[PDB]
Design an enzyme around this catalytic site. Sequence first.
Site, PDB file in Angstrom:
ATOM      1  CG  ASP A  57      -1.726   1.329   0.987  1.00 50.80           C
ATOM      2  OD1 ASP A  57      -2.572   1.267   0.871  1.00 50.80           O
ATOM      3  OD2 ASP A  57      -0.968   1.898   2.523  1.00 50.80           O
ATOM      4  CE  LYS A  70      16.557   5.735  -2.556  1.00 54.20           C
ATOM      5  NZ  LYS A  70      16.098   7.192  -3.476  1.00 54.20           N
ATOM      6  CE1 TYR A  89      -4.789   2.695  -3.557  1.00 57.50           C
ATOM      7  CE2 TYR A  89      -6.446   3.528  -1.825  1.00 57.50           C
ATOM      8  CZ  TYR A  89      -5.356   2.613  -2.322  1.00 57.50           C
ATOM      9  OH  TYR A  89      -3.979   2.884  -1.355  1.00 57.50           O
ATOM     10  CB  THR A 114      -7.533  -0.262   6.185  1.00 58.78           C
ATOM     11  OG1 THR A 114      -6.220   0.915   6.633  1.00 58.78           O
ATOM     12  CG2 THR A 114      -8.728   0.882   4.990  1.00 58.78           C
ATOM     13  NE  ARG A 118      -3.757  -1.111   4.601  1.00 57.56           N
ATOM     14  CZ  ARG A 118      -4.936  -2.322   4.375  1.00 57.56           C
ATOM     15  NH1 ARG A 118      -4.493  -3.518   4.702  1.00 57.56           N
ATOM     16  NH2 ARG A 118      -5.659  -1.949   2.974  1.00 57.56           N
ATOM     17  CB  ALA A 120      -7.247   4.144   2.496  1.00 56.40           C
ATOM     18  N   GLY A 121      -6.444   4.424   5.622  1.00 55.95           N
ATOM     19  CA  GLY A 121      -7.213   3.415   6.324  1.00 55.95           C
ATOM     20  C   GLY A 121      -6.417   4.396   7.479  1.00 55.95           C
ATOM     21  CE1 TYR A 189      -8.161   0.392   0.543  1.00 57.28           C
ATOM     22  CE2 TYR A 189      -7.556  -1.752   0.316  1.00 57.28           C
ATOM     23  CZ  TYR A 189      -7.420  -0.023   0.530  1.00 57.28           C
ATOM     24  OH  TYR A 189      -6.402   0.495  -0.555  1.00 57.28           O
ATOM     25  CG  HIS A 250      -2.300  -1.076  -2.577  1.00 61.00           C
ATOM     26  ND1 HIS A 250      -2.642  -2.068  -1.691  1.00 61.00           N
ATOM     27  CD2 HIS A 250      -2.470   0.297  -1.837  1.00 61.00           C
ATOM     28  CE1 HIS A 250      -3.522  -1.354  -0.885  1.00 61.00           C
ATOM     29  NE2 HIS A 250      -3.858  -0.416  -1.008  1.00 61.00           N
ATOM     30  CB  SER A 256      16.462   1.968  -6.195  1.00 60.63           C
ATOM     31  OG  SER A 256      15.481   1.944  -6.553  1.00 60.63           O
TER      32      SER A 256
HETATM   33 FE   LIG Z   1      -4.711   1.351   0.208  1.00 61.31          FE
END
Ligand SMILES: [Fe+3]
EC number: 3.4.21.-
Length: 324
Positions: A57, A70, A89, A114, A118, A120-121, A189, A250, A256
């Site tokens: 996420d 990295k 989203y 969530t 994270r 959204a949560g 979620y 996500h 790298s």
């Molecule tokens: Fe998420």
Amino acid sequence: RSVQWCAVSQPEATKCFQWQRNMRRVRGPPVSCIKRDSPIQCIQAIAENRADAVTLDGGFIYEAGLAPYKLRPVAAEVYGTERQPRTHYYAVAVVKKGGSFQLNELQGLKSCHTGLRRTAGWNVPIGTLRPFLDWTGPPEPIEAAVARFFSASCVPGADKGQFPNLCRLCAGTGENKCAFSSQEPYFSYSGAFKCLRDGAGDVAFIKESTVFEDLSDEAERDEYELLCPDNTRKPVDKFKDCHLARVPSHAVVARSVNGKEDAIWNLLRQAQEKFGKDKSPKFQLFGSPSGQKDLLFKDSAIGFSRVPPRIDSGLYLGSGYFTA
Ligand SMILES: [Fe+3]
């Protein structure tokens, strides 16, 4: 030296071996499975060349990109529908219809998240809510300001001992209570939406698709609305005009330097064609067993989109924005 995928839990490792077996059965590219116990343990394993890829996420993509790691995003998850796919989203605040409290009136209420750190949560809602908090700033953990803002919450991954309030509404039994895994019924979620659905919390900080996917009876959608940043409440289908933030999806991250990007992409490209959305009935790359949440990839996602070279976590993330 096949791609080594990193699982952040046992159920995820179990799915990874199932993915692996199926790739073998269909003669597709091989995928090895390494098991760890947390997103940061997988990030470290990759940086240490003990693993090669892990889906994270955005809150974790950020952490993964910091030294000494990295790691960079190499493939983004695709959501939406086949006809209308998207690699982004919306962080939303879902509530029960009937209430009158608005986004600026959550002090003392119960919340479902969530998981700690994270997008959204946690990051978006807590960031958005900052004006309403009494955070004195570092070195005070923002969890303290939050634990004293909401009367009780379920923030999977929160420190049970230090901030008991952030885990009080969590449904896990014994040590599973407040776990940042499927061991906690209110994780991620779908788990956070369940926390609201069951009435344990007054507001759930999740994404726009949860409510549509988790209700087997569309009539039940009428029981829910969204808290808009302008302090109004609107139907769950009005997320485009009523969200806390719009953020990039996500993404699978890798080293790298010598990160095996072409191999990871070849694996994902093929995994999607053979076991993606409505492909094989024997295994679903985007499905998880009963009671498990988003094992390896987001449940119900529809595919991947390759991330152009030289885009680091910072650049990948810079497409997300918050309606504060
Ligand atoms: Fe998420």
